[PDB]
């Protein structure tokens, strides 16, 4: 519940190592004495595992992740491990997988169980008539929303006193593959050599529950007993491991069990064992895989003339809605970051643009219908809004794409004399056309009077004037309205608008002038004409380049030098090896320079011997006298 542990102390994270553990049966398949390999989420050899234990003032309970899949050791003596809380986010809003056994039943409930602030199991009253009674059945608060309650057959809950050795060595492998919360276990009673768990172990499946949920966390229901405020915790430890996608080489016996299990990436000798499908390697040099120089990073060069954005947007001579000055925008740097920092706007409405890729994606033909109107008439210029503007003189179509940008200039365009020169339309004769300037300057005849210029009797003059007083309200302010229309995907893009540094002599992954290339970037010496950009080789590939931002001649040398060569003697002779990389320069990392490549882990000799293990270029290898692997030029014969 909430009673805190008196024996809780922050013990340091002792990083022990899973030596030979982590080998399980993959499925129900039998073979007879083959060397079968596979690759799956495994506990790797000689990898860190966090040492956990209990003592009379150190007793903890870590929230541990269950992301990939976990390994679990347990060196009990008197059942210090009791149960498991396999909760995803340790919440009762979702269902937490509870596993518990009080030496009666392995009770599995896929239910919503609330994690208490300090749940604890344990035993007490072990002086007279003990019978292994339990401390507190208060490891939860809520109990609801059960999909599948389950009781398996109870395992060997060791009520028998087996003290001393770690014979209660419980190996638990837990993972999920497609809703299968599988238990891969095998209780292996140890044989005492010197006090420690190490040896060749094999594990098997026990039960599966096809549930279909995820779990990302776990704790473990511990026990308390004294050889925990009133009944302390004894001396019993365990390890905690994970699962990583290693590649094993399993050897089977005659009658079922695994005999040898060899992980690949532990040393390249084991990699050679993986490749050759043999646990015993004969005498000779071999070849495991390839070598790949890693690309370090990338170099991207953005393009840098400018569109009239300090000119049209900062103009003085303006237009009207009755006749708008259609700006011609074609093949200019569409600087939309200087459109972005302008916080002086009033109404900025971008309908069908790519507003994240303003500078990235660029457009075919941009038409800026910029015209200054009265303040209230901004809400009508929209696909979906009509009225005094949209159906009278200036129609955006229903296939409109572009922005509508407005900002006020009440300090300059307002006047006591008033900006009555910019005239606007009030009535409507014909159905309004999209993107067509209606400049019909004829009297709006609404009757049987042929006006033809005169006003008065049935002669309506809708060509009215802006009253831009210096004390205008919010509806009469002169807004510098720009409806930035454009044309999308009907031409190759003309109106088109943060580069990186230059890194030479390193294996990077550049992106110069559309192509994303990879190689060590040096500087060439050729004669590039200023239009000539791409050097081609005899193999018709990219050889020598130039930055489109800064004029400079470059040279490219590709990465991924050669492959992996493995030098070994006979396995019955020795198990020390030597590493050779195929025709590389000594860069990666004893270290020798040969014509065959950079040699690793050998001794050079000022003599010459008869060739046993050849390498190349008249250089052979041998295991002579401490005995090690020496590198030497081959003896050509007896100088008789």
């Amino acid at each position: 519940q909430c009673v805190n542990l008196t024996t809780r102390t922050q013990l340091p994270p002792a990083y022990t190592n899973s030596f030979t553990r982590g080998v399980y049966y993959p499925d129900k398949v039998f073979r007879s004495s083959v060397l079968h390999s596979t690759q799956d989420l495994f506990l790797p050899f000689f990898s860190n595992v966090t040492w956990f234990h209990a003592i009379h003032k150190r007793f903890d309970n870590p929230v541990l992740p269950f992301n990939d899949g976990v390994y679990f050791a347990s060196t009990e003596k008197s059942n210090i491990i009791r149960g498991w809380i396999f909760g995803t986010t340790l919440d009762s809003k979702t269902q937490s997988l509870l596993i518990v056994n009080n030496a009666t039943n392995v009770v599995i409930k896929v239910c919503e169980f609330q994690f208490c602030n300090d749940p604890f199991l344990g035993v007490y009253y072990h002086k007279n008539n003990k019978s292994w009674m339990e401390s507190e059945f208060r490891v939860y608060s809520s109990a609801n929303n059960c999909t599948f309650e389950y009781v398996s057959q109870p395992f060997l809950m060791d009520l028998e006193g087996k003290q001393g050795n770690f014979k209660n060595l419980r190996e638990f492998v837990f993972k999920n593959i497609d809703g299968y919360f599988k238990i891969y276990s095998k209780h292996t009673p140890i044989n005492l050599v010197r006090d420690l768990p190490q040896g060749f172990s094999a594990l098997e499946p026990l039960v599966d529950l096809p549930i279909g949920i995820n779990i990302t966390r776990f704790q473990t229901l511990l026990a308390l007993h004294r050889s925990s405020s009133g009944w302390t915790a004894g001396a019993a430890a365990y390890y905690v491991g994970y699962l990583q996608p290693r590649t094993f080489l399993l050897k089977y016996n005659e009658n079922g069990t695994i005999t040898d299990a060899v992980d690949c990436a532990l040393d390249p000798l084991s990699e050679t064992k993986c490749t050759l499908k043999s646990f015993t390697v004969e005498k000779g040099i071999y070849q495991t895989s390839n070598f790949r120089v890693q690309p370090t990073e990338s170099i991207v060069r953005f393009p840098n003339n400018l569109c009239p954005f300090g000119e049209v947007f900062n103009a003085t001579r303006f237009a009207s809605v009755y006749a708008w000055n259609r700006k011609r925008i074609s093949n200019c740097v569409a600087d939309y970051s200087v459109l972005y920092n302008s916080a002086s706007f009033s109404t900025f409405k971008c309908y069908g643009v790519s507003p994240t890729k303003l500078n990235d994606l660029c457009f075919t033909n941009v038409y800026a219908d910029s015209f200054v109107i009265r303040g209230d008439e901004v809400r009508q210029i929209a696909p979906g809004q009509t009225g005094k503007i949209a159906d009278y003189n200036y129609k955006l179509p229903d296939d409109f794409t572009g922005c509508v940008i407005a900002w006020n200039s009440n300090n300059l365009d307002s006047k006591v004399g008033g900006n009555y020169n910019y005239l606007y339309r009030l009535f409507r004769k014909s159905n309004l056309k999209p993107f067509e300037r209606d400049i019909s300057t004829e009297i709006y005849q609404a009757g049987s009077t042929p006006c033809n210029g005169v006003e008065g009797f049935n002669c309506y003059f809708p060509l009215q004037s802006y009253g831009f007083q210096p004390t205008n309200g919010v509806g009469y302010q002169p807004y510098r309205v720009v409806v930035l229309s454009f044309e999308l995907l009907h031409a190759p893009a003309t109106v088109c608008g943060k580069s990186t540094n230059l890194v030479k002599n390193k294996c990077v992954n550049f992106n110069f002038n559309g192509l994303t290339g990879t190689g060590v970037l040096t500087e060439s010496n050729k004669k590039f004409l200023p239009f000539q950009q791409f050097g081609r080789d005899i193999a018709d590939t990219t050889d020598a380049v130039r930055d489109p931002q800064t004029l400079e001649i470059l040279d490219i040398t590709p990465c991924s030098f050669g492959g992996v060569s493995v030098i070994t003697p006979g396995t019955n002779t020795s198990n020390q090896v030597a590493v050779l990389y195929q025709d590389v320069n000594c860069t990666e990392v004893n270290v020798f320079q040969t014509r065959a490549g950079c040699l690793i882990g050998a001794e050079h000799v000022n003599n010459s011997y008869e060739c046993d293990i050849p390498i190349g270029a008249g250089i052979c290898a041998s295991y002579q006298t401490s005995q090690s692997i020496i590198a030497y030029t081959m003896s050509l014969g007896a100088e008789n």
Partner: nanobody
Amino acid sequence: QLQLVESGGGSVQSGGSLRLSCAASGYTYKTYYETYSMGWFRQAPGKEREGVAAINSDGETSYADSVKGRFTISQDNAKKTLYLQMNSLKPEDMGMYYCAADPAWQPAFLLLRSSGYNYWGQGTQVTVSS
């Protein structure tokens, strides 16, 4: 005509943790996109309709600094449903919440101004007792 359905109200105390939700209705989605400029325009008893939590089509959230640090507006574009996790309601959070609509893209300094919203929802009410 583009319409919206406010919901998510609830009469709580001073410091309530609720969530708003704006169900998308209407007939016009006048854009080639499904991402829009929206915002929960609260109109308090005794104050005007004000931009409290607003977000545009790119995700630039617009907040007021008196209510900043508690609320969480999340425009779920896969269902066109605007949300506002009303966390720890101060006593000025009472009011009729209006999610407004726009088929366009507004910046961070114009999402709070309700002058450019020609499509308005119904409205939801939250009673924040002090």
